[PDB]
Amino acid sequence: AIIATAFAETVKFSGSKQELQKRTLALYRQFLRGAPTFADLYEVQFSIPTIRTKIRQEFERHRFVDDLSIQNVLYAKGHMEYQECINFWKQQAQFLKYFPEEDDIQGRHQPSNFVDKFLKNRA
Amino acid sequence: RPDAEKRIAAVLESFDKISNPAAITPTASFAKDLNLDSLDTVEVVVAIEEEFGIEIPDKEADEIKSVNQAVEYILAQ
Amino acid sequence: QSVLVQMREGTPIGLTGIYQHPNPRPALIALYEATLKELQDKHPKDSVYRQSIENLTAHRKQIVEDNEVSEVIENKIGAGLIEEVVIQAHEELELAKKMSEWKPWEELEEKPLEDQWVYFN
Amino acid sequence: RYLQHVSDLHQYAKYIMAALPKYIQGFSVWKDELTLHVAPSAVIPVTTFLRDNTSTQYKSIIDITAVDYPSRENRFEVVYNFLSVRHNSRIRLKTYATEVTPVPSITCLYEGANWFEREAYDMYGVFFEGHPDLRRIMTDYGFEGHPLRKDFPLTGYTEVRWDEEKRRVVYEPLELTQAFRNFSAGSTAWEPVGPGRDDRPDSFKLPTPK
Amino acid sequence: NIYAGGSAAAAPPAGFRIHRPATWEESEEGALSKATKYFLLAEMFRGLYVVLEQFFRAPYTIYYPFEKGPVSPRFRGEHALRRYPSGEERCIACKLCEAICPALAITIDAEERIDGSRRTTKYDIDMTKCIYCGYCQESCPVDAIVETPNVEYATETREELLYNKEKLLANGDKWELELQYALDADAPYR
Numbered sequence: 001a002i003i004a005t006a007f008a009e010t011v012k013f014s015g016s017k018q019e020l021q022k023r024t025l026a027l028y029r030q031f032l033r034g035a036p037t038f039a040d041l042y043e044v045q046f047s048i049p050t051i052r053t054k055i056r057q058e059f060e061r062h063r064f065v066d067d068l069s070i071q072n073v074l075y076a077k078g079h080m081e082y083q084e085c086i087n088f089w090k091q092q093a094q095f096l097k098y099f100p101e102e103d104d105i106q107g108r109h110q111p112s113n114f115v116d117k118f119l120k121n122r123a
Numbered sequence: 124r125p126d127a128e129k130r131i132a133a134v135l136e137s138f139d140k141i142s143n144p145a146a147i148t149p150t151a152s153f154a155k156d157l158n159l160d161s162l163d164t165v166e167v168v169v170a171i172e173e174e175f176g177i178e179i180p181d182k183e184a185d186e187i188k189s190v191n192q193a194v195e196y197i198l199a200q
Numbered sequence: 201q202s203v204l205v206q207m208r209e210g211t212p213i214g215l216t217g218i219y220q221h222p223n224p225r226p227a228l229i230a231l232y233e234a235t236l237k238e239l240q241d242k243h244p245k246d247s248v249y250r251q252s253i254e255n256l257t258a259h260r261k262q263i264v265e266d267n268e269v270s271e272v273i274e275n276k277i278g279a280g281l282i283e284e285v286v287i288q289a290h291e292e293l294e295l296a297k298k299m300s301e302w303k304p305w306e307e308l309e310e311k312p313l314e315d316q317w318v319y320f321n
Numbered sequence: 322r323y324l325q326h327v328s329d330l331h332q333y334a335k336y337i338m339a340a341l342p343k344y345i346q347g348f349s350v351w352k353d354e355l356t357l358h359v360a361p362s363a364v365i366p367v368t369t370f371l372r373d374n375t376s377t378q379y380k381s382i383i384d385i386t387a388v389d390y391p392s393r394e395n396r397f398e399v400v401y402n403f404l405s406v407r408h409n410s411r412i413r414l415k416t417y418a419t420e421v422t423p424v425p426s427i428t429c430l431y432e433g434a435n436w437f438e439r440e441a442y443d444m445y446g447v448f449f450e451g452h453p454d455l456r457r458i459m460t461d462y463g464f465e466g467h468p469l470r471k472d473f474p475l476t477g478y479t480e481v482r483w484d485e486e487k488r489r490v491v492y493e494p495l496e497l498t499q500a501f502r503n504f505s506a507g508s509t510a511w512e513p514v515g516p517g518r519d520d521r522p523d524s525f526k527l528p529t530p531k
Numbered sequence: 532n533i534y535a536g537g538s539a540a541a542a543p544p545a546g547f548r549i550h551r552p553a554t555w556e557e558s559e560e561g562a563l564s565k566a567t568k569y570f571l572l573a574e575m576f577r578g579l580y581v582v583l584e585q586f587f588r589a590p591y592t593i594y595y596p597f598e599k600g601p602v603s604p605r606f607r608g609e610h611a612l613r614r615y616p617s618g619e620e621r622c623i624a625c626k627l628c629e630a631i632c633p634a635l636a637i638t639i640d641a642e643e644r645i646d647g648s649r650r651t652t653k654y655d656i657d658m659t660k661c662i663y664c665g666y667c668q669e670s671c672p673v674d675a676i677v678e679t680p681n682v683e684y685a686t687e688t689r690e691e692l693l694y695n696k697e698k699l700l701a702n703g704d705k706w707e708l709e710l711q712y713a714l715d716a717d718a719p720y721r
């Protein structure tokens with residue numbers, strides 16, 4: 001395989017943290033710009049701002065990561081996920097892995113205190 | 124180009140983490156004057172370019188830090 | 201001067217993609233002289249690498265320089281066809297040019313840990 | 322023949338180490354199989370030497386993979402397999418790579434190799450720096466985890482079923498109707514094989530004094 | 532001799548240089564003779580004639596619901612728990628067929644009675660996941676489970692497809708004489 005696929009980039013490992021910060025910056029710009037495509041493409045029920053606030057809160061999850069090479073693998077995994085999402089490779093049931101809390105409320109009795117955990121012995 | 128900063132203020136007003144919608148001056152810094160993050164900066168710039176239909180490269184997206192630079196950039200079309 | 205090492209158009213021989221090379225012996229001996237010149241200039245005379253490739257291309261060049269016809273030297277070399285021999289001489293030449301900058305004759309730079317090449321014993 | 326031939330293979334590999342002392346850490350032979358023990362920053366020059374020398378022209382990547390031993394600090398070992406179709410010979414090349422650090426990719430040299438490299442990527446999470454189209458292959462697209470890895474269980478984490486409500490398949494944590502019962506617990510408590518003899522030729526083991 | 536190095540006795544063979552492809556003028560047939568094959572489709576009618584030869588011979592086809600194809604005695608189909616002559620269950624709860632199964636279909640519960648003999652309270656094969664390797668027949672020392680050569684047992688639910696002890700003892704009841712015949716004919720080669 002000589003030529004690559006469409007949105008791919010050669011996986012290459014930066015030696016500094018600021019260059020990685022620039023790359024994750026451009027990456028969030030790519031997700032956020034392609035967010036109107038995903039609602040048309042995967043036929044979701046909901047609004048484009050919920051896609052955008054999810055992309056934001058999935059980069060909130062790894063804001064305080066110190067180690068450089070763990071940021072490096074995290075960037076490579078994020079670019080692979082962008083690559084799958086911007087094409088039609090993922091389907092609409094694996095795109096909705098990302099939104100389990102939105103689609104339906106499962107029922108009563110979400111346990112909060114120790115008693116509600118304990119009546120069904122920590123579920 | 125009149126009525127542009129009113130449109131940019133209308134876009135920038137619809138967000139959160141801004142406890143003063145009246146603090147949008149035409150020389151407002153995103154990080155300093157409005158208390159925005161890095162992700163907030165590249166959220167507001169994408170929401171700015173979404174309003175028009177234009178598209179921006181990386182070297183012209185990474186440099187925008189204030190709304191003065193957005194109103195300086197606006198006349199590319 | 202330049203040299204051509206593989207015709208990709210001409211009359212066919214048994215290997216496809218490889219066609220018959222016009223005048224393979226001058227190409228061959230000039231490519232050899234490039235190998236000898238490079239490894240004499242750039243590799244230091246202790247190292248095993250330049251010693252065997254010097255002896256190698258010397259004994260290989262002797263067969264080419266001292267016999268004339270096609271089929272008898274491609275039996276006396278014992279490797280493949282003369283087009284293919286020109287290609288692998290081109291290839292060992294490019295190798296010998298990469299080795300002057302990759303510098304293999306040093307000591308090893310990355311020592312293994314003591315508990316690493318231990319499988320099940 | 323075969324005793325002579327394995328003693329010849331020993332000497333060939335002794336030569337291969339002496340030609341490149343900066344890059345080759347070890348070599349081991351076991352029954353007409355040759356393994357070259359190479360650092361991870363040492364992959365590309367050794368593979369060019371294996372492609373390019375006339376004594377050593379392997380030309381053709383067959384199969385590459387990783388293997389994890391979690392009991393070592395550098396977890397995965399990445400093993401390469403080559404075939405000189407001229408000299409009718411096989412050779413093997415082992416490096417190492419932790420979960421987080423890379424190994425560089427030989428897809429600049431070997432054109433078949435890239436598909437193998439992303440296979441071993443998905444099964445093991447081992448990185449190939451310098452590789453176009455590094456992403457998953459032969460697993461699920463939204464699959465979280467690396468399967469051929471010792472912390473990953475047998476049946477995995479998730480399972481698939483059709484929810485009627487959402488009118489789509491949903492992904493759920495694992496519930497079995499019959500639990501997996503490994504019978505590895507119940508192996509032998511005596512040592513099953515001895516140490517065994519050696520096939521080292523007399524020329525390549527260290528002399529006793531006097 | 533000594534070879535060049537980088538080089539062995541596996542030279543190219545005598546004649547591996549293949550000749551130049553012959554031109555139009557070093558051809559044995561005329562252009563008119565070649566054009567008769569070109570325009571009149573000489574080898575098209577040959578392959579037409581082959582399929583017409585196949586039209587006039589007697590076909591290979593067989594009626595399924597009234598004839599079954601040729602089978603071996605060592606063939607494997609649905610399971611059966613055998614019995615002894617003079618009526619005895621023959622599965623001694625020895626637990627080998629459960630330990631060998633490459634898909635873990637067997638599930639056995641074993642309990643011992645006052646008599647001192649050993650049997651199974653619950654025998655079970657999941658036939659959604661039995662794979663028909665016949666190792667379970669090969670492992671049992673007393674020859675208590677076999678593979679009857681029946682294949683015509685397709686069901687409509689999965690709960691029918693979970694074979695308990697009673698269904699497999701019924702299968703050992705019905706298939707017995709052909710089962711014993713197949714095992715006796717197999718028995719020299721085992």
Ligand code: SF4
Pocket residue numbers: 631632633634635636637656660661662663664665666667668
């Ligand atoms: S035939 Fe194979 S899979 Fe089926 S019960 Fe016997 S050993 Fe198990």
Ligand code: SF4
Pocket residue numbers: 621622623624625626627628629639670671672673674675676
């Ligand atoms: S069928 Fe054979 S292996 Fe299975 S419980 Fe009975 S005697 Fe043991």
